[PDB]
Design a protein around this ligand. Sequence first.
Ligand SMILES: NC(=O)c1ccc[n+]([C@@H]2O[C@H](COP(=O)([O-])OP(=O)(O)OC[C@H]3O[C@@H](n4cnc5c(N)ncnc54)[C@H](OP(=O)(O)O)[C@@H]3O)[C@@H](O)[C@H]2O)c1
Ligand SMILES: Nc1nc(N)c(OCCCOc2ccccc2CCC(=O)O)c(-c2ccccc2C(F)(F)F)n1
Length: 163
Amino acid sequence: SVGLIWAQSTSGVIGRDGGIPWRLPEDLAHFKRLTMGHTVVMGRRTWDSLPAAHRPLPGRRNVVVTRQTGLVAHGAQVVGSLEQALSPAEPDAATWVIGGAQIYALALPLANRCEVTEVDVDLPPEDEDALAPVLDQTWAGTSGEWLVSRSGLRYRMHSYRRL
Ligand SMILES: NC(=O)c1ccc[n+]([C@@H]2O[C@H](COP(=O)([O-])OP(=O)(O)OC[C@H]3O[C@@H](n4cnc5c(N)ncnc54)[C@H](OP(=O)(O)O)[C@@H]3O)[C@@H](O)[C@H]2O)c1
Ligand SMILES: Nc1nc(N)c(OCCCOc2ccccc2CCC(=O)O)c(-c2ccccc2C(F)(F)F)n1
């Protein structure tokens, strides 16, 4: 099973300036709970965006997709395409594609589940922002209730599965 997991502003922003333009502890916790013990596949820019104590993501098999033959990514497995990332020598019951926008676009046709956090933060998109994938009619979903973070932002989780 191949799943995508991301958090986006309502406006569709997932990344800015090489990082994340909000802080949402409940989403970090959701992400860590869903992915612990499993494989996480990411693009090289997402690998470079990870803060020090999270590079590699502890307790997960980290797979980094790059065209740079020769890239060294201590704590991760480097592969040269998304198809390679999804063709492991050692299978995993759960593989999560964890970003960014470039890799989500390649992975969406291959995935059967998306776990989406929606963040009610007003972020007019800016020209270099990374943006969320768009789900078409081949996906159907369920939405949790709007919740308020301990840090103040409204947020909610959505779970989509391929029809
Ligand atoms: N909100 C969220 O859920 C979330 C999640 C993850 C990341 N982010 C944010 O999103 C941003 C990063 O996303 P991004 O879209 O800029 O980059 P990305 O998708 O993480 O990484 C892009 C890189 O992946 C590699 N790549 C792309 N297509 C490839 C292909 N067909 N074959 C091989 N390698 C390929 C290339 O690496 P090389 O250049 O090395 O060849 C490319 O530069 C950051 O701001 C990060 O903080 C947000
Ligand atoms: N729902 C969902 N889907 C994702 N794919 C996702 O990004 C995973 C890649 C970045 O990880 C970081 C980024 C900053 C700090 C810590 C971590 C990992 C935490 C861990 O697990 O050790 C996240 C996420 C997790 C933590 C913070 C921010 C985000 C954000 F990107 F959404 F904003 N949340």
